[PDB]
Amino acid sequence: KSLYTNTSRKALEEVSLKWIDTASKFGKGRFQTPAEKHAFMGTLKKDL
Amino acid sequence: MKLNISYPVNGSQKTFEIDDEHRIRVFFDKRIGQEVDGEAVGDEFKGYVFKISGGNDKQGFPMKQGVLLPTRIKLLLTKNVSCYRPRRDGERKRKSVRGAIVGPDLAVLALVIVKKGEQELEGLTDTTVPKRLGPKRANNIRKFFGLSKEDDVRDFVIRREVTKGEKTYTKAPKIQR
Amino acid sequence: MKVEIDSFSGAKIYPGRGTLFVRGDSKIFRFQNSKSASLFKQRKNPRRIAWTVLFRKHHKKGITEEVAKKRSRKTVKAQRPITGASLDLIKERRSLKP
Amino acid sequence: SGNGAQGTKFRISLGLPVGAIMNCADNSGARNLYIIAVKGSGSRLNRLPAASLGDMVMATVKKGKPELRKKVMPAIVVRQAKSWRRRDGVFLYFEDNAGVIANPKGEMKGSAITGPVGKECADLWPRVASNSGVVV
Amino acid sequence: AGMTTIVRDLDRPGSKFHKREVVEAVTVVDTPPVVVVGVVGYVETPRG
RNA sequence: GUGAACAGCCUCUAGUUGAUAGAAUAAUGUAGAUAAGGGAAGUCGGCAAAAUAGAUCCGUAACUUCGGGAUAAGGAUUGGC
RNA sequence: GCAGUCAAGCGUUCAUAGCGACAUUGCUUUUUGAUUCUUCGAUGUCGGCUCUUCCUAUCAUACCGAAGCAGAAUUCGGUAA
RNA sequence: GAAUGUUACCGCAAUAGUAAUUGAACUUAGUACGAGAGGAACAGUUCAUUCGGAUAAUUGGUUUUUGCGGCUGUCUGAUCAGGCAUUGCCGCGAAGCUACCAUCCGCUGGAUUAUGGCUGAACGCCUCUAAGUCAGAAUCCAUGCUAGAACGCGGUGAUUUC
RNA sequence: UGUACAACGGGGUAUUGUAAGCAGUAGAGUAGCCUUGUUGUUACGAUCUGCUGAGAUUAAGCCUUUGUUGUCUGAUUUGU
Numbered sequence A: 001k002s003l004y005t006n007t008s009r010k011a012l013e014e015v016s017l018k019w020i021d022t023a024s025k026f027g028k029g030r031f032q033t034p035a036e037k038h039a040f041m042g043t044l045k046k047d048l
Numbered sequence B: 001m002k003l004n005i006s007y008p009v010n011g012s013q014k015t016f017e018i019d020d021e022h023r024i025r026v027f028f029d030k031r032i033g034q035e036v037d038g039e040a041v042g043d044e045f046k047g048y049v050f051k052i053s054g055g056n057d058k059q060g061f062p063m064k065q066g067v068l069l070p071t072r073i074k075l076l077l078t079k080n081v082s083c084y085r086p087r088r089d090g091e092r093k094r095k096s097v098r099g100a101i102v103g104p105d106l107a108v109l110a111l112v113i114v115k116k117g118e119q120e121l122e123g124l125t126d127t128t129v130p131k132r133l134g135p136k137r138a139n140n141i142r143k144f145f146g147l148s149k150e151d152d153v154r155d156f157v158i159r160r161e162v163t164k165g166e167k168t169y170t171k172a173p174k175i176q177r
Numbered sequence C: 001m002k003v004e005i006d007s008f009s010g011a012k013i014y015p016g017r018g019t020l021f022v023r024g025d026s027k028i029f030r031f032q033n034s035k036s037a038s039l040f041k042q043r044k045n046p047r048r049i050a051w052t053v054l055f056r057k058h059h060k061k062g063i064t065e066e067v068a069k070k071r072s073r074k075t076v077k078a079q080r081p082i083t084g085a086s087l088d089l090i091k092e093r094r095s096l097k098p
Numbered sequence D: 001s002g003n004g005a006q007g008t009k010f011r012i013s014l015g016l017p018v019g020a021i022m023n024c025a026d027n028s029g030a031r032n033l034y035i036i037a038v039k040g041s042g043s044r045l046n047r048l049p050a051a052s053l054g055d056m057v058m059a060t061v062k063k064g065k066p067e068l069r070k071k072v073m074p075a076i077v078v079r080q081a082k083s084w085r086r087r088d089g090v091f092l093y094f095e096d097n098a099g100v101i102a103n104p105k106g107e108m109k110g111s112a113i114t115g116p117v118g119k120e121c122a123d124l125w126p127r128v129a130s131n132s133g134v135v136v
Numbered sequence E: 001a002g003m004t005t006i007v008r009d010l011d012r013p014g015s016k017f018h019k020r021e022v023v024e025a026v027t028v029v030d031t032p033p034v035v036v037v038g039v040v041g042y043v044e045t046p047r048g
Numbered sequence F: 001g002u003g004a005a006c007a008g009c010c011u012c013u014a015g016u017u018g019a020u021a022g023a024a025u026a027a028u029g030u031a032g033a034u035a036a037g038g039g040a041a042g043u044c045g046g047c048a049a050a051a052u053a054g055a056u057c058c059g060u061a062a063c064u065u066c067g068g069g070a071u072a073a074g075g076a077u078u079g080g081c
Numbered sequence G: 001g002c003a004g005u006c007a008a009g010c011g012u013u014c015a016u017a018g019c020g021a022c023a024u025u026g027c028u029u030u031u032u033g034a035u036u037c038u039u040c041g042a043u044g045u046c047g048g049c050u051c052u053u054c055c056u057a058u059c060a061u062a063c064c065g066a067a068g069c070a071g072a073a074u075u076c077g078g079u080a081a
Numbered sequence H: 001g002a003a004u005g006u007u008a009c010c011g012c013a014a015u016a017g018u019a020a021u022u023g024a025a026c027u028u029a030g031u032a033c034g035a036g037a038g039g040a041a042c043a044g045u046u047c048a049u050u051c052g053g054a055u056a057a058u059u060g061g062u063u064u065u066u067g068c069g070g071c072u073g074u075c076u077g078a079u080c081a082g083g084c085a086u087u088g089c090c091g092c093g094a095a096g097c098u099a100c101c102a103u104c105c106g107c108u109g110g111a112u113u114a115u116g117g118c119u120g121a122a123c124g125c126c127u128c129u130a131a132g133u134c135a136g137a138a139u140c141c142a143u144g145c146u147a148g149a150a151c152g153c154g155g156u157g158a159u160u161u162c
Numbered sequence I: 001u002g003u004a005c006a007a008c009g010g011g012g013u014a015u016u017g018u019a020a021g022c023a024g025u026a027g028a029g030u031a032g033c034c035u036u037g038u039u040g041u042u043a044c045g046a047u048c049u050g051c052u053g054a055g056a057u058u059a060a061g062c063c064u065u066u067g068u069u070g071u072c073u074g075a076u077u078u079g080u
């Protein structure tokens, strides 16, 4: 907990996210979800 | 964004306004021609199916079926083509055009009703506007009544009344062919 | 928040992702990553690069069900007649015979 | 920046240190601009001052009309090529370095700007806004 | 845990990016309920 | 074998496989590399480094003791089948 | 090199806002001299690069007093390294 | 890192260090002042510089991931698959490391100086000063921040039997 | 001796850019036999196409796991 009550404007601003990235951090991720990836890729040699 | 809806069965039209990204979001990434179920856009239109027919972005440039893209481009346009009326024999003008894929930049989405959902939309289903003109060519009267080349048209031509204040008149076409 | 696409490869560029190249003629080229970006700088031709959309589109790879039929049609038949001309005496005179 | 720069400018990656030569993208007669200083930039042992989009530099015309050569005039930077990043998250870069010669108040010497212009420059200097075609 | 990216609108009347989206990096820390196992009382002394 | 080649690189014959060894891979080194944007602003000074390069064709200034300058400069080309 | 005291003048008028002659009392030791005390069985006897710290006789920045300070700008001075 | 019973956990804080800096724009305001020419500032806001401490989602750099692919010369009868060329060469390249080339963060109380004052004698008057006293600076002391005295210290756990 | 630990295996995630093999009416073309072609036939041909966004690699400081396999008391020292 901060040791003072900042007025700042910068503090006080009441954020609200629109979108939180969720693509892989282990590479140049392209897809938020498996659902998204499945959507865009089409059907693969594994799969159904 | 503004929705311009037509019910091509009554010849109705009325515009609707929708200020809700989520309620809008349905039409995004949809092209011209793709069908769109209704309930997503409101509760009024539950079931109602919409065909997407075009629209204008802010700046007013029009969509053009089959460009794909959800952006603007500048095309060469010719005779017999949308978003262009040639001013001179064999003239083509190079004009900006908006894509056929719906984005949040559209000021207006043009829409057509294809199936009427479970409820009535006021200025649309409830009102029905008559077809201005009637059949003028010979066989066309014969087909807008189904008559066989026996029945004689001259009395099946349509007749539109009008008044001159105290003279009520009558004027039928001029059957060609 | 618009997701963009890669103008070499065709992948979705979610936000803050990859680079953006404003070419001399003001044509703009959005890349999702340094791969497309270098192939692109290398005057490589996306149609010859297997993993690209543009490739696959032109080689008809795994589209399968988009060329499969559908069910999108209507059924009307509503009389309106002709304005000024009695839309009343235009269905009773429309009894036909054949 | 400074004089005639109405507005502020969020920091953008310095791309042209002193000695850089940018294409001159107006119609004044000048073909290139040789950067000799950067306006409103500070001091550090051995740091070269460096300009970025929408910066005012002092320059000379190394290759241009003779009436534009052998003298120091102001200029404004309009295209980068060193990748910078906007607050909307995008790293972008032009294909060349390019500014246009201007007076201290930030008025153009010539009357067209040939080529695209970065928005962060258009925003910054009005008469540069005017003479633009494609911005960004 | 790590970091991801965020997109949100900015509320900063005066800024060029007022009412425009910004993209911002964030860190995430894993935060399962702490459990209380004791209290400890301190007193003031002239040695602290 | 490649290639203009007694070059470099790989091979046959022959001959070696000697050079304290193990475990780690901190700073600083020695030797080998790369680096966005800028391009000598560094420095006594471009020191170091980078750039260039083979061949075939096209093209080639000043000046000169007429022999040269000259691979001047500047360009295109080059695989496989 | 730096800082004073006297105050004849300078400053339209007005010694001392800002200055200041003839004189005169000082401080400093990045000047140069004077000396020759230490080192001649050797204290690496230009400058730059780097990097720390210290002085203040303060260029900037904080807060002040003063003006021949209307404003703007400037100048003199204090506390200040 | 030996020795202050052993061992473990949680803490205190002496002393020492300490840090932030400067500019501009908008607005005030074409306002105060001025015949005119010109022409400010406090409050508010947005950015910046120089400095510092981190950090690696993003972008960029790095490449023995010798990871995938490509190429020359040769050697393994060919094929598959490979060896060698002080890491043979080239394109991409994850992870790590990393950059004002990238992002994020850099605290608020008091006491004071100069100075302007209060009350006020000395000196019936007068004086900020003698007693007493108010306001006050990039100063100082704290707050915060970094060590933690290996001879400063507290609380607490468990403490060996063949 | 248990939401134990490890070695493999699996699944995710990632990197490359389409494996080997086979097939083909793709292929500038080329030989060979005759029964000299109203696709004559048998092969060969850089490359191309299909099975095939395949194959390979993927923690060595990525994520994960109902499977498989194994491991689970050696040493030394300390007391107010």
Ligand SMILES: O[C@H]1[C@H]2c3cc4c(cc3CN3CCC(=C[C@@H]1O)[C@H]23)OCO4
Binding pocket: G039, G042, G043, G044, G045
């Ligand atoms: O050592 C001697 C001096 C010296 C003698 C030299 C020499 C250098 C020096 C250095 N000087 C500094 C002070 C010194 C004092 C002494 O006199 C030295 O180079 C050759 O001889």
Ligand SMILES: [Mg+2]
Binding pocket: B176, B177
């Ligand atoms: Mg006719």
Ligand SMILES: [Mg+2]
Binding pocket: C034
């Ligand atoms: Mg790269």
Ligand SMILES: [Mg+2]
Binding pocket: C034
């Ligand atoms: Mg990279």
Ligand SMILES: [Mg+2]
Binding pocket: D024, D025, D026, D031, D114
């Ligand atoms: Mg030009």
Ligand SMILES: [Mg+2]
Binding pocket: D045, D046
């Ligand atoms: Mg220097």
Ligand SMILES: [Mg+2]
Binding pocket: none
């Ligand atoms: Mg010349």
Ligand SMILES: [Mg+2]
Binding pocket: D130, D131
């Ligand atoms: Mg104009």
Ligand SMILES: [Mg+2]
Binding pocket: none
């Ligand atoms: Mg021998």
Ligand SMILES: [Mg+2]
Binding pocket: F019
């Ligand atoms: Mg030896």
Ligand SMILES: [Mg+2]
Binding pocket: none
């Ligand atoms: Mg060894």
Ligand SMILES: [Mg+2]
Binding pocket: none
């Ligand atoms: Mg290691």
Ligand SMILES: [Mg+2]
Binding pocket: none
């Ligand atoms: Mg470089």
Ligand SMILES: [Mg+2]
Binding pocket: none
């Ligand atoms: Mg150059």
Ligand SMILES: [Mg+2]
Binding pocket: none
């Ligand atoms: Mg120099």
Ligand SMILES: [Mg+2]
Binding pocket: none
């Ligand atoms: Mg030069």
